[PDB]
Motif scaffolding. Structure first.
Motif, PDB file in Angstrom:
ATOM      1  N   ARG A   1      11.221  -4.441 -17.420  1.00 21.94           N
ATOM      2  CA  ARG A   1      11.067  -3.220 -16.769  1.00 21.94           C
ATOM      3  C   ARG A   1       9.909  -2.903 -16.357  1.00 21.94           C
ATOM      4  NH1 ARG A   1      11.246   1.528 -19.619  1.00 21.94           N
ATOM      5  NH2 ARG A   1       9.490   0.981 -20.791  1.00 21.94           N
ATOM      6  N   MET A   2       8.797  -3.340 -17.007  1.00 23.67           N
ATOM      7  CA  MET A   2       7.680  -3.322 -16.244  1.00 23.67           C
ATOM      8  C   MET A   2       7.125  -4.035 -15.282  1.00 23.67           C
ATOM      9  SD  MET A   2       5.393  -0.481 -16.622  1.00 23.67           S
ATOM     10  CE  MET A   2       4.000  -0.202 -15.243  1.00 23.67           C
ATOM     11  N   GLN A   3       7.384  -5.396 -15.696  1.00 24.68           N
ATOM     12  CA  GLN A   3       6.391  -6.345 -14.840  1.00 24.68           C
ATOM     13  C   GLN A   3       7.964  -5.931 -13.137  1.00 24.68           C
ATOM     14  OE1 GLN A   3       8.440 -10.136 -15.602  1.00 24.68           O
ATOM     15  NE2 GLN A   3       6.968 -11.543 -15.159  1.00 24.68           N
ATOM     16  N   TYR A   4       8.808  -5.011 -13.235  1.00 18.90           N
ATOM     17  CA  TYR A   4       9.772  -4.656 -12.119  1.00 18.90           C
ATOM     18  C   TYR A   4       9.281  -3.522 -11.333  1.00 18.90           C
ATOM     19  CZ  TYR A   4      11.179 -10.155 -12.096  1.00 18.90           C
ATOM     20  OH  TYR A   4      11.464 -11.228 -12.606  1.00 18.90           O
ATOM     21  N   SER A   5       8.798  -2.792 -12.109  1.00 16.63           N
ATOM     22  CA  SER A   5       8.253  -1.146 -11.999  1.00 16.63           C
ATOM     23  C   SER A   5       6.978  -1.498 -10.484  1.00 16.63           C
ATOM     24  CB  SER A   5       7.038  -1.002 -13.318  1.00 16.63           C
ATOM     25  OG  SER A   5       6.750  -1.325 -12.859  1.00 16.63           O
ATOM     26  N   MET A   6       7.142  -0.367  -9.782  1.00 14.58           N
ATOM     27  CA  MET A   6       6.772  -0.511  -8.126  1.00 14.58           C
ATOM     28  C   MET A   6       5.468   0.021  -8.366  1.00 14.58           C
ATOM     29  SD  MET A   6       5.197   1.865  -6.229  1.00 14.58           S
ATOM     30  CE  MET A   6       6.400   3.483  -6.524  1.00 14.58           C
ATOM     31  N   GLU A   7       4.915   1.107  -9.644  1.00 13.29           N
ATOM     32  CA  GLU A   7       3.558   1.459  -9.787  1.00 13.29           C
ATOM     33  C   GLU A   7       2.808   0.309 -10.564  1.00 13.29           C
ATOM     34  OE1 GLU A   7       6.176   2.411 -11.600  1.00 13.29           O
ATOM     35  OE2 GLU A   7       5.795   1.987 -13.561  1.00 13.29           O
ATOM     36  N   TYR A   8       3.397  -1.452 -11.051  1.00  7.71           N
ATOM     37  CA  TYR A   8       3.344  -2.420 -11.116  1.00  7.71           C
ATOM     38  C   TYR A   8       2.309  -3.059  -9.832  1.00  7.71           C
ATOM     39  CZ  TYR A   8       1.950  -7.112 -13.544  1.00  7.71           C
ATOM     40  OH  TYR A   8       1.755  -8.059 -13.465  1.00  7.71           O
ATOM     41  N   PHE A   9       3.494  -3.280  -9.150  1.00  5.12           N
ATOM     42  CA  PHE A   9       2.958  -4.209  -7.338  1.00  5.12           C
ATOM     43  C   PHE A   9       1.534  -3.462  -6.834  1.00  5.12           C
ATOM     44  CE2 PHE A   9       6.430  -7.381  -6.827  1.00  5.12           C
ATOM     45  CZ  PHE A   9       7.152  -7.667  -8.139  1.00  5.12           C
ATOM     46  N   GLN A  10       1.882  -2.130  -7.196  1.00  7.79           N
ATOM     47  CA  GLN A  10       0.498  -1.918  -6.746  1.00  7.79           C
ATOM     48  C   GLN A  10      -0.660  -1.704  -7.182  1.00  7.79           C
ATOM     49  OE1 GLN A  10       2.756  -1.037  -3.851  1.00  7.79           O
ATOM     50  NE2 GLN A  10       0.373   0.459  -3.108  1.00  7.79           N
ATOM     51  N   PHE A  11      -0.348  -2.006  -8.327  1.00  9.13           N
ATOM     52  CA  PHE A  11      -1.233  -2.326  -8.825  1.00  9.13           C
ATOM     53  C   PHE A  11      -1.861  -3.583  -9.214  1.00  9.13           C
ATOM     54  CE2 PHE A  11      -3.808  -4.636 -13.400  1.00  9.13           C
ATOM     55  CZ  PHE A  11      -3.816  -4.683 -13.220  1.00  9.13           C
ATOM     56  N   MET A  12      -1.184  -4.903  -8.360  1.00 11.68           N
ATOM     57  CA  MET A  12      -1.209  -6.069  -8.414  1.00 11.68           C
ATOM     58  C   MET A  12      -2.499  -6.116  -6.888  1.00 11.68           C
ATOM     59  SD  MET A  12      -1.428  -8.760 -10.098  1.00 11.68           S
ATOM     60  CE  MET A  12      -1.241  -8.189 -11.513  1.00 11.68           C
ATOM     61  N   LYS A  13      -2.405  -5.295  -5.436  1.00 11.69           N
ATOM     62  CA  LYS A  13      -2.098  -4.889  -4.800  1.00 11.69           C
ATOM     63  C   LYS A  13      -3.738  -4.258  -4.940  1.00 11.69           C
ATOM     64  CE  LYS A  13       1.806  -4.370  -1.601  1.00 11.69           C
ATOM     65  NZ  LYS A  13       2.204  -3.810  -0.471  1.00 11.69           N
ATOM     66  N   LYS A  14      -3.876  -3.227  -5.528  1.00 14.60           N
ATOM     67  CA  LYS A  14      -5.376  -2.910  -5.543  1.00 14.60           C
ATOM     68  C   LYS A  14      -5.751  -3.772  -6.430  1.00 14.60           C
ATOM     69  CE  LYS A  14      -3.814   1.133  -3.888  1.00 14.60           C
ATOM     70  NZ  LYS A  14      -2.509   0.191  -3.754  1.00 14.60           N
ATOM     71  N   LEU A  15      -5.929  -4.579  -7.218  1.00 12.54           N
ATOM     72  CA  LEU A  15      -6.650  -5.412  -8.376  1.00 12.54           C
ATOM     73  C   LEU A  15      -6.734  -6.662  -7.444  1.00 12.54           C
ATOM     74  CD1 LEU A  15      -7.424  -5.449 -11.303  1.00 12.54           C
ATOM     75  CD2 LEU A  15      -5.728  -7.612 -11.369  1.00 12.54           C
ATOM     76  N   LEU A  16      -5.978  -6.966  -6.035  1.00 12.03           N
ATOM     77  CA  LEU A  16      -6.066  -7.990  -5.795  1.00 12.03           C
ATOM     78  C   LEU A  16      -7.726  -7.972  -4.592  1.00 12.03           C
ATOM     79  CD1 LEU A  16      -3.032 -10.176  -5.452  1.00 12.03           C
ATOM     80  CD2 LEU A  16      -4.471 -10.098  -7.207  1.00 12.03           C
ATOM     81  N   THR A  17      -6.910  -6.924  -3.772  1.00  7.23           N
ATOM     82  CA  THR A  17      -7.532  -6.343  -2.990  1.00  7.23           C
ATOM     83  C   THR A  17      -8.930  -5.943  -2.615  1.00  7.23           C
ATOM     84  OG1 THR A  17      -5.767  -5.934  -1.074  1.00  7.23           O
ATOM     85  CG2 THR A  17      -7.525  -4.713  -0.448  1.00  7.23           C
ATOM     86  N   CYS A  18      -9.132  -4.865  -4.007  1.00  7.61           N
ATOM     87  CA  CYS A  18     -10.800  -4.691  -4.912  1.00  7.61           C
ATOM     88  C   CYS A  18     -11.837  -5.779  -4.732  1.00  7.61           C
ATOM     89  CB  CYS A  18     -10.337  -3.649  -5.884  1.00  7.61           C
ATOM     90  SG  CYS A  18     -10.862  -5.162  -7.286  1.00  7.61           S
TER      91      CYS A  18
END
Lengths: 18, 343
Positions: free
Chosen positions: B326-343
């Protein structure tokens, strides 16, 4: 509106329209 | 094979026990009964998962198997003591003072619906019973002759939970197929057995609570051959009704009497038909194919049910597996990826 078999045709067509 | 059936009965109990544990603590929306479908066989024959069947046939087979498993494991019959009852068939003759009485065990109450409009009315039919007269007059074995006798059915033992079947099905020989009846029928939220019990009739004629509260409404919607089953169930809370259909559990507004009529009471209504791109208005009488099938009534954790007379592992792992995914497909996780990659 202005003709018997056409009555069933229109009814059957009125469900066929999108 | 008695040994095979004993394990068959016990195996159902184990499979059913798992289902209680999951619904108690599984964090997923619903459960898929893998073992329950594989283990249970209807009257020995395997259950087809794509075949519609009467719930009572499944109900009758299930309640018997669990009772057998309990007896095989040394426990008493949980459901028979709490849900099953005993009729008191009475035969009273008018021409002679001979009276015949016998006890008949049962699981659910069957009430006539075609000739009755409310659950009360179908219930005095048991108290009033039937009269045998003429060539049909009951033949008294002691008198060795035919004499008019009133054959009535009364409940002798009151189970803590009362099961009532709402007879809306039969067979049509002209159609050569099962048919459903959507006759309008009535039943109250709070129901009283006392005038309809053996004691009540004896009290009125002149020689342990009796009140029950409705908690479960099984509803059928569709054809007799097919259709759908779902329930409306009360939650025992310290401070309500819910809508149970398949894997979905939601709230309901059927506590109102109007929604009580629209859903479970069934019956006729003069429906309005909308068609022709909202240009043609028509009125057609319509049947409420959605209506009650079986009712459950509760009287107002027992150690005797635990007393002898004669796993949480699958729960935990499916909790952990889901909340991991459930955490893998959570929308806040995908936004964590976007911040992590684009930081």
């Amino acid at each position: 509106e202005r003709s018997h078999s056409a009555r069933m045709t229109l009814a059957k067509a009125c469900e066929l329209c999108p | 094979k008695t040994e095979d059936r004993k394990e068959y009965n016990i195996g159902v109990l184990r499979h059913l026990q798992v289902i209680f544990g999951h619904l108690a603590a599984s964090r997923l929306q619903y459960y898929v009964p893998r073992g329950f479908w594989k283990q249970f066989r209807l009257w020995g024959e395997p259950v087809n998962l794509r075949e519609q069947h009467d719930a009572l046939e499944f109900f009758n087979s299930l309640v018997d198997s669990l009772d057998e498993a309990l007896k095989a494991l040394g426990h008493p019959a949980m459901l028979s003591k709490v849900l099953g009852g005993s009729f008191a068939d009475q035969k009273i003759c008018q021409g002679c003072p001979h009276r015949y009485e016998c006890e008949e065990s049962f699981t659910t109450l069957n009430v006539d619906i075609r000739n009755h409009q409310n659950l009360l009315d179908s219930l005095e039919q048991y108290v009033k019973g039937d009269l045998l007269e003429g060539a049909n007059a009951y033949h008294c074995e002691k008198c060795n002759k035919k004499v008019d006798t009133v054959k009535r059915l009364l409940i002798k033992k009151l189970p803590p939970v009362l099961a009532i079947q709402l007879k809306r099905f039969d067979y049509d020989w002209e159609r050569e197929c099962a048919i459903k009846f959507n006759d309008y029928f009535e039943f109250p939220r709070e129901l009283d057995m006392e005038p309809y019990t053996v004691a009540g009739v004896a009290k009125l004629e002149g020689d342990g609570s009796t009140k029950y509260r409705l908690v479960g409404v099984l509803v059928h919607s569709g054809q007799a051959s097919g259709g759908h089953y779902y329930s409306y169930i009360i939650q025992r809370n310290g401070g309500r009704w819910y809508k149970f259909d398949d894997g979905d559990v939601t709230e309901c507004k059927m506590d109102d009497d109007e929604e009580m009529k629209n859903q479970c009471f069934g019956g006729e209504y003069m429906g309005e038909v909308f068609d022709h791109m909202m240009k043609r208005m028509s009125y057609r009488r319509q049947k409420r194919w959605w209506n009650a099938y079986i009712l459950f009534y509760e009287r107002m954790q027992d150690d005797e049910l635990i007393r002898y007379i004669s796993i949480e592992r699958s729960v935990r792992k499916q909790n952990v597996q889901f909340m991991h995914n459930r955490m893998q497909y959570s929308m806040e996780y995908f936004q964590f990826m976007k911040k992590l990659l684009t930081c």
